[PDB]
């Protein structure tokens, strides 16, 4: 398994944006990792 659409969680900010947070790595980001659609 690798980049098989997963290892990322979505979150909504007060601003009204949906960001993501890699759990396995614990890394947040605003840009989607072309594997969360």
Curated annotation (Swiss-Prot):
* UniProt superkingdom: Eukaryota
Residue ranges of domain WW in the record: 2-35
Q: Where in the cell is it found?
A: Nucleus
What does the protein in this record do?
Transcription factor that binds RNA polymerase II and inhibits the elongation of transcripts from target promoters. Regulates transcription elongation in a TATA box-dependent manner.
What is its quaternary makeup? Binds RNA polymerase II, HD and SF1. Binds formin. Interacts (via the second WW domain) with TREX1 (via proline-rich region).
Q: What is known of its domains?
A: The FF domains preferentially binds peptides with the consensus sequence [DE](2-5)-[FWY]-[DE](2-5) and mediate interaction with HTATSF1 and probably bind the phosphorylated C-terminus of the largest subunit of RNA polymerase II.
Protein name as annotated: Transcription elongation regulator 1
Question: Which organism is this protein's natural source?
Answer: Mus musculus (Mouse)
The gene it comes from is: Tcerg1
